[PDB]
Amino acid sequence: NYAPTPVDRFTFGLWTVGWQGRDPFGDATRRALDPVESVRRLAELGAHGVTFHDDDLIPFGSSDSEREEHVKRFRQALDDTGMKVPMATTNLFTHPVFKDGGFTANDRDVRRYALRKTIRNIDLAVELGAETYVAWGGREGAESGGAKDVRDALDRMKEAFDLLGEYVTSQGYDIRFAIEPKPNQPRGDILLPTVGHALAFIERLERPELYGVNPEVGHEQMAGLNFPHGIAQALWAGKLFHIDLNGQNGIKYDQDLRFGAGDLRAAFWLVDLLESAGYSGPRHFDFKPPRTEDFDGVWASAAGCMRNYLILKERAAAFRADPEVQEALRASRLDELARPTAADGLQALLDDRSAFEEFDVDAAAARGMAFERLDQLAMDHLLGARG
Amino acid sequence: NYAPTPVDRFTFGLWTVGWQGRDPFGDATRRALDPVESVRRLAELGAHGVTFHDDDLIPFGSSDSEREEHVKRFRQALDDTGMKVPMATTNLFTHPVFKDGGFTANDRDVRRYALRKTIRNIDLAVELGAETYVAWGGREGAESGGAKDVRDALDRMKEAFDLLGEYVTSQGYDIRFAIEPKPNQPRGDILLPTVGHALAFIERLERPELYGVNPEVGHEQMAGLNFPHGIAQALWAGKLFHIDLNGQNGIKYDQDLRFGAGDLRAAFWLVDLLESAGYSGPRHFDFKPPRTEDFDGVWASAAGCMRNYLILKERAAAFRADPEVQEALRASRLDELARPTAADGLQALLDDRSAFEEFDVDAAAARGMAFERLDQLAMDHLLGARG
Amino acid sequence: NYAPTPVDRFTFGLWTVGWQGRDPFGDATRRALDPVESVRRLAELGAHGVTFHDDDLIPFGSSDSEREEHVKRFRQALDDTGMKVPMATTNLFTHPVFKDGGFTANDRDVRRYALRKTIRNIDLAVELGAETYVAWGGREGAESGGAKDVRDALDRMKEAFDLLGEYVTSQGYDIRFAIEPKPNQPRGDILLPTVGHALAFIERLERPELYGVNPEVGHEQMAGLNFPHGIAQALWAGKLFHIDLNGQNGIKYDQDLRFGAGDLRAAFWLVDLLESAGYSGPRHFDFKPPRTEDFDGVWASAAGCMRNYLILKERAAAFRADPEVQEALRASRLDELARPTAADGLQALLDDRSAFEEFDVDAAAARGMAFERLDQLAMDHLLGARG
Amino acid sequence: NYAPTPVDRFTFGLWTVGWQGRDPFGDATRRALDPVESVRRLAELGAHGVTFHDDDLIPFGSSDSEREEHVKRFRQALDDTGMKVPMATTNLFTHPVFKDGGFTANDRDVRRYALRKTIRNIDLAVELGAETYVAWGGREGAESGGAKDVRDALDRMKEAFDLLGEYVTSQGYDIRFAIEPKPNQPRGDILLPTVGHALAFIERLERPELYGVNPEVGHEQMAGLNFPHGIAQALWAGKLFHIDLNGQNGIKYDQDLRFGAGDLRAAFWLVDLLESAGYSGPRHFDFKPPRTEDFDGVWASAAGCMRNYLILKERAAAFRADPEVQEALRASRLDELARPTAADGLQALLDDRSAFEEFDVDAAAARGMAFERLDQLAMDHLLGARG
Ligand SMILES: [Mg+2]
Ligand SMILES: [Mg+2]
Ligand SMILES: [Mg+2]
Ligand SMILES: [Mg+2]
Ligand SMILES: [Mn+2]
Ligand SMILES: [Mn+2]
Ligand SMILES: [Mn+2]
Ligand SMILES: [Mn+2]
Ligand SMILES: [Mn+2]
Ligand SMILES: [Mn+2]
Ligand SMILES: [Mn+2]
Ligand SMILES: [Mn+2]
Ligand code: NA
Ligand code: NA
Ligand code: NA
Ligand code: NA
Ligand code: NA
Ligand code: NA
Ligand code: NA
Ligand code: NA
Known part of the structure; x- marks a missing residue:
């Protein structure tokens, strides 16, 4: 039952099932995975595709011959499986040079390097067929008030995304950008901390039609916000270009639990909204199998992401189709x-x-608004308890 | 020392010092204040002006003769003191008819009434000289997922603010609107929950230049966000039309502590930013003297709002002027x-x-970024401990 | 299906279904209910019993003849329905005299009055058959650091509960006390803010065996804690004398949603733990039908509390009974x-x-720990999706 | 001004100034420090002593000759500087074998190994003169409900601490234990999540007098709690055996900012309480210089921890000594x-x-309670603004 098919457009980052388990307090618990093995295993589970940061596919500092061989092996795996690559992104957060940011580092030389690293990978993304290029500016922000003038940083952040827009226009590429907000972690506060702040920023870019958001379930929940409401505002604005699905238990460090874990009723209302609105983009999982797990638990956790989406899709469709719910x-x-x-x-x-x-x-x-009887019909449909 | 003058543009809502102390669990602890006595007492403390909801000035359901007499007494108090009224707003949250919202109530008849109640008070605001008309949509939102289709609610919320824009254009008024975000309370989730969401929404209005934000310190902190960063984005967008100053201890119910209480270093960095940016609007306090206090404690708490702004202004100016800080x-x-x-x-x-x-x-x-030595110079300046 | 019976020991506070809807920002939306009508309606839904604060049953300041008549009517309703009264408590939070506390008010005269008001209602509780006497010290705490010396307040809080212990011993009563923690609201911080702090305090009372905890789902979640884990520690200590069931969406003002709303998987793991441990006390709901609802929505929301407990009981029992889960x-x-x-x-x-x-x-x-496959079996059982 | 002396009992973990900057998203930004260089640099700043986990001093898996040489070099540095070692602890969280816990791992063989690793380091702690042995059970807990039966885990956690108590009694050691709570991170929920839960657990140990708490400022603030209130309850119980000082901005991942950063007024009220109560233990910093910093910023951030304690000590003493505050x-x-x-x-x-x-x-x-005038006198004293 609930068996995913590539039809379902479920995608996963290489860094998700490939996460080796290092956390602020602990060493890796799993060996590194070859992207070829992740592509083949995910296809075996019924995934549609994968996504990558540059440095997940090509080790940082690789020579041009090394880069070619890594890409060639990855493309053979995609060809062998029918997997697609709908999205790619840049790692502008792991290397120490990005400790105060990429596009909004105080050092100008780092901001220029961050742009050149991004542009190199946009070209690769296009070669692999990606429609969306994500940017999660996890190092853009501060731990202290004097360290970062936020109006100057927003000027630099607009300059950077404007130059990227100029680049893809000049090359005739059809790719579009999706900015991923997060409120904090690893910086004490991150710039563009929510879907709202990112939507507002996009309106001030020189070519606003080239940019949307890539909201992540757990990131908006790290600010205690309602993720389905934020997705509704992104859809209202015509800016839901991509989405990251996972679970989170409230205001904590970014847990990246499998989708359906964390806030289960918010997962139900999210799937109801995506399906009702006819969202056509990838159902992408940005999650981490907990470091307690071996590789069988990695693939079980990835299978659970897709299974929970499909169970929630069935229950939300049954809720909307029920003549008693339509009456309520x-x-x-x-x-x-x-x-x-x-x-x-x-x-x-x-x-x-x-x-x-x-x-x-x-x-x-x-x-009376009769909202409680409506919500109990929704609970009964989610739990398969109608009667 | 630190003695406020009307020069300082400090303003207070009638509902702030007039809050009688009723909370979710407790009855009022203070009698109601006549707005005339609040105007005279605030002037005696060095305030510049007051602000009002319609129903703070004119009891709900007043006859036209009653309305005239309430306004006449209030204007005599303003004339007797030199106090101004730079801002006014509508109460679209207390009366039971607004339990599912004003502009985004599911019932259409309530949405139309909410607009007519607002328009009546815009006319009054203009007569009293207000430059800004705030809207805090505290009942716009939901406790459950099926109760409120957020894309439809945003359509209604845009229709309402567009009609208000048409109204003030047609009347030749110079007033502008300022939307006040809040993430939750009294609704389980409120629409436009942060400065970012409100800025993004404004961009989709038909006359976007007529609308800005009225951010409140404690509301952004109820989502764990950095209030100075959000004010910086509002300034970057040219949308900081008004501000509400108070204190809050993190992710809790809206406490409306006096300004400087709650997160004291965020208060320092906020004042540094407002003064450096040359913000010219009112320094408005939306706060509540705790219900433990009698009226002497009400006026002490209001005096403390202005005193803490002025202490923080002195320390932030000394920080920016110090050649050692400029070096750092x-x-x-x-x-x-x-x-x-x-x-x-x-x-x-x-x-x-x-x-x-x-x-x-x-x-x-x-x-190294040398951010820690810079931040300790900032701490030393805030605490008056340089040396 | 899922139809409650008095067998199920579901109980409700008079103040729950009787909440008139006043919140920090809004007037009442429902008329007051006569306790007799709440007893009869709750019995009609399949509840086992009700609970009360003194001032829910007997209006504050009633004469002795008025008190007798209120109690007499209530007892006739209990007799007419078979409803029980397993728990009672004191209102030491609504009247303005308790604005800085009851047992830990700074004013000694208020602390003595709070004890006499409690003792009068302990006698009434015993007359009505209650086994448990709850104390939720919602006014014990502070908004500012100098206002409340917490070591002195804990001395006063121990003195008060010791005197209550002496009182019930001297009267030969079998009732026991259950302290209800809450982290904040209506005070900026409340003393004994979590289950842990209350358990630790009880150990220092002179007759520790007379006191346990009355944890509430939403209160521990206002500190972002795991409610099932806290209930497990209370059970481990032998101190789960009573429990308050409801729902809450994370770190917010106390929402008192119906049970099963809020964090649905925490509700599942709570019911699994209560049933596995053989908890024998009341399944008491401390909840508020949202003020959007009329009285049909009040009774729908109360029915939903019991329905969701029973659905979760079925699914947790099926999870524990499944030989595949036992294997996992x-x-x-x-x-x-x-x-x-x-x-x-x-x-x-x-x-x-x-x-x-x-x-x-x-x-x-x-x-590997194989925790992800175990958790997906748990998700499949909760959603009735095994297969 | 504010110059620390060893008299002030300021201590630092080797892992604090030695933190190399690896975070969930980023590689190390600083090279590893030799403990000898940290001892000499901290002494040069005016620190009193250092603390260590076993594996900070002795690389994991060292031979007995390697262990002797590491200890010998460290003792020469202590002798060369007059630095003391008042506290030590075990690393039961970094190595992958501890991914589901040390004392409460589901695997019994891991629980036994965790005890033997602890006991080996207790002997070393005693040899170096430590009075307190801390235990922060950062891996004790769960990401999912079925993974960890919390009553069984508390039985194992009590068995472990009872065996450690038996061990130090049998050896005639005077050392005592201090349990460090944390609510979450790196586990989704950690057992004994707050000071209250740890105090309650200690009461059920077989030799309760051998155990206290080691509360950390930022950990209680990750649950939104009032840290000075929790320290007051620990002092009331006679259990404040040690403390970890740092800063935190609310409900986030554990930031370990320098002391005085984060919630500055909570730092003031904490120092007021420690000094008024005559706390005699180490003023220990468990903090991390941000990974933006080079080694000059490491030592600046450590110096700032001690400076901010001393500024706050001066201001809290002036507040308590002011006859106007005594009147208020x-x-x-x-x-x-x-x-x-x-x-x-x-x-x-x-x-x-x-x-x-x-x-x-x-x-x-x-x-009225006059709490607002009292709190503004406290604010004026903290900011050095009296007048
Ligand atoms: Mg400039
Ligand atoms: Mg429609
Ligand atoms: Mg004393
Ligand atoms: Mg068992
Ligand atoms: Mn994430
Ligand atoms: Mn993501
Ligand atoms: Mn507010
Ligand atoms: Mn406001
Ligand atoms: Mn509650
Ligand atoms: Mn309760
Ligand atoms: Mn920490
Ligand atoms: Mn620590
Ligand atoms: Na600039
Ligand atoms: Na869209
Ligand atoms: Na619509
Ligand atoms: Na502006
Ligand atoms: Na005392
Ligand atoms: Na029990
Ligand atoms: Na056991
Ligand atoms: Na102590």
Whole structure:
């Protein structure tokens, strides 16, 4: 049951199942995986594709002949399996040179190098067929107030993304960018900490149509926010270019639990929203099998990401299709929420005594919203307990 | 020492010093204050002005003769004291009719009434001289996932603010709007939960130049965010039309402590940023004297809001003026952060071997940022401990 | 399906379904309920019993004849329905006299009054058959550091609970006390903020056997803690005398959502633990139907508390009974965790080369824990998706 | 000014200034330090002593001759500088064998090895003069509910600490243990997550007098708790055997900022409490110079830990010594809080009409607490702004 197919567009970062288990307090618990073995194992589970940072595919500092051989082996694995590469990204956070940032490092020489490292990998991404190029600026930010002038850093962050936009336009590439917010970790505070801040920043870029967001479930939950609500705002803005799926238990260090773990009802409402809205992009998992696990547990945890998406898809579809839920949605006036407040226009609203002098505020206030019965129908559908 | 003057543009909501102390668990501990007495007492402390919700000034449901008399008494108090009214707002949260929202209530009749209540008070705000009209949509949101379709709610929230924009344009008013984000409370999740989400939403309004943000210190801290960073993004966007100053101890219910309480170093870095950026708007306090206090404690807590701003202003100015701090800012390359990454342009950056093949990443990585000595100079200046 | 019976020992506070909907920002949305109507409606849903604060049953300041009549009507309702009253408590938080606390108010006269108000209601609790007397010290704490010397407050808090212990011993009552922790709200920080702090405090009382804890799901989650883990420590200590069940979405104001809402997998693991441990006390709901609801939504939300407990009970029992889960528990060495580390004793452990010189740390480190497959079996059982 | 002396008992872990900067996302930014160089540099700053995990001093897997030489060099450095070693601890978290715990690993063989590794280092600690042996069980806990039966884990955790108690009694050692709580990280939830849970657990050990707590500022703040309040409960219980000082910005990953950073007013109230209570133990820093820093920034950050303690000590002493603050403490009835509620005894309290029938609750409720003026005197003293 719930068996994924490439049809389902489930994708995984090489760094997810390949995470060796090093954490702030502990050494690696698993050996490194060859990307070829991750591609073949993920295909065997029913994944559609993988994604990569440059330095997951090509060891940092590789010669041009080494780079060619790493890419060649990876492409043979993709060809052998039918796996795709819909997204790629740059590692601008692991090497010590990026300790104060890539695009917003205080040192100008580092900002220029970060751009050249990104541009080299955009070319590779396009060669592998990627539609989206993610940027998670995990080193952009500060531990102390004097270290980082945030208006100057936003100027540098806009300059960088504008230059990347100029680059892909000049090359005629169709790729687009997706900025991934995170509120903190590894910096004490990270710039563009939420979906909202990233959406607002994009509006000030010179070619705003080339940029969207890549929200991650656990990152918005590290600020205690409602992830389905933030995805709804991204969809409303036409900017949900990609998404990272995982689980998180509230306001903690980024746990990257498998999808469906962490906040299970937020996972249900997220899948309901993605499917209702017809989101067509990859269902990408940015997760880490816990370092307690051996490789059988790695593949079990990856299989669980896809299984939980598919169970939640079934239950959310059954909820929306149930004539009792449709009745309850009408009882709670979800249909009215979708109607214009005043398609009659401002002067008609001003002249309408039923909106002011003749509005019976106490009779309106007496109407219950019936939200609790609606939510218990939703709980019963999620748990398969209708009856 | 630190004695406020109206010059300092310190303002207070009528609902702040007038808060009677009712909380989720407890009855009022203070009697209601007449707005005239709050205006006279605040002037005696050195405040510049007050602000109001409609229903703080005019009891809900007042007749037109009652409304005139309440306004007349209030204007006499303003005239008697020289106090100004730079900002006003609508109460779209206390009356039970607004339990599922004003502008985004599921019931259309409530959304139309919320607009008419707002428009009536915009006219009053303009008559009293206000430059800014705030909107804190504290009832816009949900406790459960099925209750509120957030894309439909954002459509209604845009329709409402567009109609308000049309209204003030049609009347030739110069007032502008400031949206106040909050992440939760009293709804389980509130729409536009952070400065970023509000800035992004404003970009999609039909007349975006008429709207900015009114960020509140404690609200961004209820999501664990860095308030000075969010104010920097609002300033970068040209949208800091007003601000609410108070204190908060992290991720809790909205405490509205006096300014300087809560996160004291974030208060220091906020004042440093406002003064360095030349913010010219009111320094408005949205705070609550704790319900443990009698009226002498109310006025002590209000005086403390202004005193702590002025102490922090002195210390931040001394920090920025100290030639040792200016040296440390250069040692940490804050001057380079303010320089363009690539004013030579994209082709020059691509052709520059010093940005890639000849960049010595290990020598760059070895350079310390000297951020800790800079931050200890900042701590010494805040505490008046230089030496 | 899932239909509660009094057999299930589900109980509700009068203040839960009776909450009129006043919140920090809004007036009441429902009229007050007569306790007699709440008793009859809850019985109709299949509840076992109710609980009360003194001032939920007897309006504050009632004459002795008024008190008798309120109690008489309530007892007739209990007799008419078979409902029980297993728990009662004191309101030491709503009246303004308790603004700095009851037992730990700085004013000694208030501390003495708080004790006399408690003792009067202990007598009533015993007359109504209650086995447990809860104390939630929601006003014990502070908004500022100088206001409350916490060592002196703990001395006063111990003196108070010791005097209550002396009182019930002297009267030959069998009732016991259950202290309810909460980390904050309505005070900026509350004393005894978690289950751990309350358990530790109890150990220093003069008659420690008379006191346990009354943990509440949402309160421990307001500190981001694992509620099932805290209940496990309370059970380990023999101190889980009562429990408050509800839902909460992380680090926020106390939301008191219906049980099963909020963190659904924590609700599953809580029910698994209570049932496995054979907890025999009431399954008490301390929740609030959201103020969006009319009275039909109040009773729907109360019915949902019991329904979600029963669904989770079924799924947790099926998980524990499944021979595949029992196999996975052995694969993850849960059986070894329950065995003594060194029943052979310290000298045997010191002399055992297999514990040190001959322990193969790399072979041990290579063993995976298989926790992810175990957790996905748990997810499949919760969602009714086995297959 | 504020120059530390060994008199001040400031101590540092070898792992603090020696932290090489590896974090969940980034490689080391500094080379490893020889413990001899850390001892000499810390002495040059005015530190009193250092502390160590076994594997900070002796590389894991060292031969007995290697172990002797590492210890010999370290002792020469201590002798050359007058530095002391008041505390030591075991690393039961870095090596992969401890991925599910040391004392509460599900695998029994790992639990026995963890005890033997601890006992070997207790002997070394005693040889170096340590008075306290800390245990931070950072791997004790779980990411999923089925993985760890917490009652069984607490049985194993008690068995382990009982065996350690038996060991030091049998050897006639005077050392005592201090358990360090942390709520999460690196496990999804850690057992004994707060000071309260650790204090409660200690009460159930067979020799409770041998164990106290080692609270860390940032760990309690990762649960949003008030660290000075938790230290007050530990002092009240007679269990503050050691303390870890650092800074933290709220509910995040463990940041280990230098002391005084993070929540500055909580640092003030902590120092006020330690000094007022006469705490006589080490003022130990468990902190990390940010990985942005080179070694000059490491020593600047360590110097700042001690400087901020000494500035806060001066300001807290001035606050307590100020006759205006003493007056305000009396105005807020802190003197009454320290008096018994009912030294006249229970029967006298029951018979006292001034505690019930004749208590004027409205006159009591009208009395303000004057806490805001007291707190602004505290703010003025912290900032050196009196006047
Ligand atoms: Mg629609
Ligand atoms: Mg500049
Ligand atoms: Mg057992
Ligand atoms: Mg004393
Ligand atoms: Mn993540
Ligand atoms: Mn991601
Ligand atoms: Mn607020
Ligand atoms: Mn505000
Ligand atoms: Mn509660
Ligand atoms: Mn409760
Ligand atoms: Mn730490
Ligand atoms: Mn520590
Ligand atoms: Na700039
Ligand atoms: Na979209
Ligand atoms: Na719509
Ligand atoms: Na601006
Ligand atoms: Na005392
Ligand atoms: Na128990
Ligand atoms: Na056991
Ligand atoms: Na102590």
